[PDB]
C-alpha cells in the first residue's frame, strides 16, 4: 500500500497564484487524514459533506488537491455559497461540494520586505466563475462601451493584480496557503482509500 503523496502538495516550496490554482490528482493509494486534522499548523480545517473521522473509513474514485495562495481575510471565501472577488473570479466551489478546505499562514515564506508580488488574483470578469473553473486569459478587460484591441487605455484594464505581501502587513492581509481536497465518487473503480 503506497501512501498518498499529500506531502508533495502541502510541503511544496512554491505555490501557485489563486487565478492559476494548481490541481494534483491523488489516486491508487492510502491516505492518512489523521496526520492532517490533528496538526495545529493549520488555521482553517473545515470539511463539507463528510466528517473528518469517516475520511479514513471511506474510499473515493478520485481525490483532487487544489493548491494556491491568497491573503488572510479571503480564506473565508473558499466555501460553498460564498461571494467575493476570489470566489467569483478566481476559485469557486460548488453548492454540493464534498471535501475539505485547509489553510495555514505562510507569512514566513510568501512575504518579503519591500513586498512580494509573485502572487496574483483576478479583479474583473464578465461572468462569475463556474465551480472548479480556471481562468488564465490575462487579456485586456473592457468595462466600458468603447471597444478595445489589446491596448491598455481609459476603459481598457489589465485583469490581474498582485498581492503586496510584506511581513508588516496585518493578519488579514498576510499570505495564507490553501489546499482544497475534493473527494468525488463515480461509477469508476475506487483508487484512493484510507486505513480500515
Amino acid at each position, epitope marked *: 500500500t503506497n501512501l498518498c503523496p499529500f506531502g508533495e502538495v502541502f510541503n511544496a516550496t512554491r505555490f501557485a497564484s489563486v487565478y492559476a490554482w494548481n490541481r494534483k490528482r491523488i489516486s491508487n493509494c492510502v491516505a492518512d487524514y489523521s496526520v492532517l*486534522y*490533528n496538526s495545529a499548523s493549520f488555521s482553517t*480545517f*473545515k*470539511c*463539507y*459533506g*463528510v*466528517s*473528518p*473521522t*469517516k475520511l479514513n473509513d471511506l474510499c473515493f474514485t478520485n481525490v483532487y488537491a487544489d493548491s494556491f495562495v491568497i491573503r488572510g*481575510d479571503e480564506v*473565508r471565501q473558499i*466555501a*460553498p*455559497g460564498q*461571494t*467575493g472577488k476570489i470566489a467569483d473570479y478566481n476559485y469557486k466551489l*460548488p*453548492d*454540493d*461540494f*464534498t471535501g475539505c478546505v485547509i489553510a495555514w499562514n505562510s507569512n514566513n515564506l510568501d512575504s518579503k520586505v519591500g513586498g512580494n508580488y509573485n502572487y496574483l488574483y483576478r479583479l474583473f470578469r464578465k461572468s462569475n466563475l463556474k465551480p472548479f473553473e480556471r481562468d488564465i486569459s490575462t487579456e485586456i478587460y473592457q468595462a466600458g462601451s468603447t471597444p478595445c484591441n489589446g491596448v491598455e487605455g481609459f476603459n481598457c484594464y489589465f485583469p490581474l493584480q498582485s498581492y503586496g505581501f510584506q511581513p508588516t502587513n496585518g493578519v488579514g492581509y498576510q499570505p495564507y496557503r490553501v489546499v482544497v481536497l475534493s473527494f468525488e465518487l463515480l461509477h469508476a473503480p475506487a483508487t484512493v482509500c484510507g486505513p480500515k
Partner: antibody, heavy 129, light 110 residues
C-alpha cells in the same frame, strides 16, 4: 444568492398556514441549513425551526410542540407549516441560510452552522378574527 | 436552555462617538457568536461572525470582541446612518440551537 418568502396573510385563530422560502441563484444542497426566524412587531427575533439538508433531519423550537413542521419540497423550495395559530404567532417570518461544516476537536467531530449570512425580505403573518 | 442577555436596551453617542453593547451567554458558546444590524422594515444584516471576524463590506469601526460567556460589540466613529437595532446571536453546537439577544437601539446624539 437570494431568498424570497411567500405565504403570509390574515388567518383566523386556530387555523393553519404554510409559508414558502424560495432559493434563487443556489441549490438546497447538503452543505446548507435553512431556519425560520420570527419577530413580532416591535420585538426581538426568535428561531422557529431549522432543516439540515446534510442529515435530512430537523430541529424545532422549545415553545413549539408538534405545532411546527418544516419540510424540503424541492431543491429550491422549503416550506414552514404552522397549526393552532394564536395571537402570539402574529409576526413577520424570515427564512435564513447557514453554511454547515465539520471540524475536529477532542470530543471528536463537530458539525457547525453558526450564523445566517443570507436573509429574505420576509412575510407578515397576522392571526386575528 | 440558553439565554443571551443583551444590555443596555439603548445606547447613545454623538457623531464620531463610541457605543458599546454587551451580550452575555448563560453557558459558554466558544467563539460562535454573531452580531446583526437591523433597520425598520428590513431583514437583519450580518456584521460580525465568529464573534470577532468582520463581514466583507462592513466598516472597521464595527468591532466584535469576547469569548466564552461574554461578548461586546463596539461602534466607534459613529455615523448618522448607524441609528438602528443591533442583535447578538449565539450558537450552541451541542444543542444545535440559535438564541438571539433582546436587542439594542443606537441613538445618534445631536
Amino acid at each position: 444568492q437570494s431568498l424570497e418568502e411567500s405565504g403570509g396573510d390574515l388567518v383566523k385563530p386556530g387555523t393553519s398556514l404554510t409559508l414558502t422560502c424560495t432559493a434563487s441563484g443556489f441549490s438546497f444542497s447538503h452543505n446548507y441549513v435553512m431556519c425560520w426566524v420570527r419577530q413580532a412587531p416591535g420585538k426581538g427575533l426568535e428561531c422557529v425551526a431549522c432543516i439540515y439538508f446534510g442529515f435530512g433531519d430537523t430541529y424545532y423550537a422549545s415553545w413549539a410542540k408538534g405545532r411546527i413542521t418544516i419540510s424540503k419540497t424541492s431543491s429550491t423550495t422549503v416550506t414552514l407549516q404552522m397549526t393552532s395559530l394564536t395571537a402570539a404567532d402574529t409576526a413577520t417570518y424570515f427564512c435564513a441560510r447557514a453554511l454547515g461544516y465539520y471540524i475536529y476537536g477532542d470530543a471528536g467531530d463537530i458539525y457547525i452552522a453558526d450564523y445566517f449570512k443570507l436573509w429574505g425580505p420576509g412575510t407578515l403573518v397576522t392571526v386575528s378574527s | 436552555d440558553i439565554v443571551m442577555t443583551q444590555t443596555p436596551a439603548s445606547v447613545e453617542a454623538a457623531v464620531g462617538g463610541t457605543v458599546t453593547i454587551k451580550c452575555q451567554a448563560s453557558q459558554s458558546i466558544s467563539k460562535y457568536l454573531a452580531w446583526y444590524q437591523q433597520k425598520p422594515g428590513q431583514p437583519p444584516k450580518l456584521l460580525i461572525f465568529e464573534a470577532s471576524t468582520l463581514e466583507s463590506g462592513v466598516p472597521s469601526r464595527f468591532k466584535g470582541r469576547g469569548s466564552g460567556t461574554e461578548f461586546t460589540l463596539t461602534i466607534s466613529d459613529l455615523e448618522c446612518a448607524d441609528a438602528a437595532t443591533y442583535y447578538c446571536q449565539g450558537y450552541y453546537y451541542s444543542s444545535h440551537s440559535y438564541v438571539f439577544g433582546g436587542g439594542t437601539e443606537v441613538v445618534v446624539k445631536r
